């Protein structure tokens, strides 16, 4: 029982006990032909019918990816590792439906992050049964190919055209348009939300005309398509295809001859070589990711945003307080999760070489000067704080603000937030602060489960974030307009208002990081 | 009558009616042999005795110099023009003595400014009879050679060794040591005070060991030896000697052969050519000025200050609010004293080329970025204000602070001020603000004369400035320590306290222009 008839066949789900209520979950529904052998590196193929009833009571396979092993046994880094079998057969999606079955329900579609090299929708931190139970929305989750298997690019070649992972997400959005009405949802009321590389993916759908009728609104959590790490140039993506082929002995005279050889190698052989296709690899380097392929993306996001060519709708964008601290541990000299990581002035200068290898020896002296105007000249952690703000401002915070500013410049309602609560359950040290990716547990309502022992102020904060996230998806406004709560105002290009999120109280502020953002936007391009 | 016996002969002065009292003035006392013919370009020669009584009841000749004719009839620019005959016979000094004749009186020695190309001690704005009457100090004034006649440099050549004008001032200080006791003064209680190029001259005496026993303390008004315009390099001073010789047809095989030809030309012929010895001349370019001659100055001031090699004593340093506005009128495109001078963004960019011709096209983009962080983005006079602050910070304010900071770093008491009152009698337009050189009328007590129609608040401000100036000369502390007045604290390298001067009330502030000074001191040297 619990049978829903899709356009490709019947599926069977489960009923889950969630907070004294029931939520219907369909885990592991296929939405594309398995990209195997002949179909590796190609765009996803639409499914045909299946006979019988597909039993969707199980989290499906995770896409082929390397696993973070920098800290064995550490929950802070292994919580982002896949919790299902790794396989190329991984194009599946999940649906959570509130019980009893709703009618014309708002849909929220999650796109996970992972630097376009890792990630899966089955992580317990992405479980949408809490959102479906508390906010009565339908939550859809999806797995898309990462690494070379999802973004190996030979522009113009249909055997490996690039942006395959973005086409995986797009076909899952096509499945929602065709089938979500059978589950009780409104295909004209779908909101995309995602984090990190998932937020860049969400904003890339705003810039892809083919995805425009597949969703209504968008939520960008700590990421945007115009971030420096998001979209690489087509010739840079092409050079990484050859380098991978050269590493695997697949260098050939002909383009398809390269693909034919790569299709014969084991998926692990490809995974074991993606790290060596970039000359100088920064901890924020995307080995294989989105590019300008001429199909999903016809130009660089900065060019498309300037021309105003994007989906005209409302958006919700925001960042965390300490966005860059997580990446300082993974390769910046002098940093560690096992001590306070007080670094010298020269260690700061080596850190900027780690993150900015192509910047002139002059240019890093410019970054040094703009970030050493110490409030207290004798705070020992002055340089450790500065390098974290350098990574946070350039790679995440400032690009997120420019994306919201450009949407407001074209008459679209944007809502900016600033998440500044360090989780009591955060496994990383206290000096790393409100880290990259640790607002997701609050977005999905994990503090509401009392067995995980979050504070009562965290359950209140999570409940308000879910209410603001779901209200924006339902109505385009993340506010409860009458109960005399704090009203989240519209982010304007002028006043630049934004809302804080913490256990204390939500406050209205203006021009977030406006000073340091002016450096990256008006002086850094001039080297 | 009124006869004083000097070491070279008797002099006769006058008694002046000053505010219902008398002040004895000796105007035009010679202190060196006239630097004529054989003595042109050489260091001043000490005087021999004269028979009879030199009648010192007349302002002496002004040194040969060009006259500002940019605005005919304008009092704001012609008030700085000489008011006596121009002649090479100009090494004379003035003494003002309070009546009745005092005993062991503190002496204040004024050194005028004029960019080392102009200036005279006989200007009504430098009259020291008010200071002598009100504060009971002895005021000494001096004329020194300017232009090529005072700073034509051939390093190591006693026919034209350079820094002759600084040696003119030094011999006048030697005269004070030898003769001021006959006038009622204490040679061990002499304070040098000066403005603009006179303040750089004062600080250069702090850096010249030969001048150390010739004074006790120093007051620096809108100028310092470490200012970028103060001291030019010996080979740059040498190149300007040849260029002047080449302009006058005096190019020769031999060094003294050049001097012999230049000694034959008329003094006006030299004056008519000093403007063309510099390739790109900024409005703050010193055609012929101080250099490292190995005698008066053995190294650059920045090097001497770093090594701590200077006269250890108390100093009083300060600047005006709008130091750079005067120089924008004399050659910056888009500025004029007859309108509000609202300039565009490109006019600002041309202004930085006018003042920074040797700075890379890159480097002026750096100055552009640091000075365009507008408070109000739509103030029309935003760029006009920015260019005035660029000239004021780099050429005057920040070097004055570094000079006081380095003195405090070596355990010397420094007192910094910030003059921010626009004179009611200021002839220049209102947009130029508290301009360069318009605190001198208050230092010399001109507002006390009621026939000049200053406001009552200006007489109060002038009286307090004279009291602070004279108290520092007498005691080393510019404060009246008990009458519950505002206590001027010591300028420290840390807290960086300074005092404001205006008609409202004197207030204590900290770290003046600390942000923009950090740009010129820590980033601009790196181009
Ligand atoms: Cl399944
Ligand atoms: Cl419902
Ligand atoms: Cl509930
Ligand atoms: Cl092979
Ligand atoms: Cl492109
Ligand atoms: Cl005379
Ligand atoms: Cl007296
Ligand atoms: Cl009086
Ligand atoms: Cl000749
Ligand atoms: Cl030198």
Numbering used by the authors:
A (entry chain A), B (entry chain A): 3 to 529
Sentences from the paper on this structure:
Butyrylcholinesterase (BChE, EC 3.1.1.8) is the circulating homolog of acetylcholinesterase (AChE, EC 3.1.1.7), a membrane anchored enzyme responsible for the hydrolysis of the neurotransmitter acetylcholine in the inter-synaptic space in the central nervous system and neuromuscular junctions. However, its roles in decontaminating toxic circulating compounds such as nerve agents or cocaine, hydrolyzing the “hunger” hormone ghrelin, as well as being a potential drug target candidate for late stage Alzheimer’s disease have been demonstrated. Attempts to express human BChE in E. coli were not successful, leading to isolation of the enzyme as non-refoldable inclusion bodies, certainly because of the presence of three disulfide bridges and nine N-glycosylation sites that enhances the stability and solubility of the enzyme.
While no BChE activity could be measured in the total soluble extracts of hBChE-wild-type (WT), hBChE-1, and hBChE-2 constructs, increasing activity appeared in the remaining constructs in correlation with the increasing number of mutations, and maximal BChE activity was detected for the hBChE-7 construct. From crystals grown at 4 °C, complete datasets were collected and integrated in space group C121 with unit cell of a = 160 Å, b = 75 Å, c = 122 Å; α = 90°, β = 93°, γ = 90° with a resolution cutoff of 2.5 Å. We found two monomers in the asymmetric unit and statistics for the refined model are presented in Table 4. The overall structure is very similar to previously recombinant human BChE solved structure (RMSD = 0.452 Å). Active site residues and residues forming the gorge adopt very similar conformations when compared to respective residues from the structure of recombinant human BChE from CHO cells. Taking account residue occupancy, this bond is partially broken in chain A (about 30%) and totally in chain B. On contrary, the two other disulfide bonds, Cys252–Cys263 and Cys400–Cys519, remain formed for both chains. Interestingly despite the partial formation of the Cys65–Cys92 disulfide bond, the overall structure remains unaffected in particular for the active site gorge region.
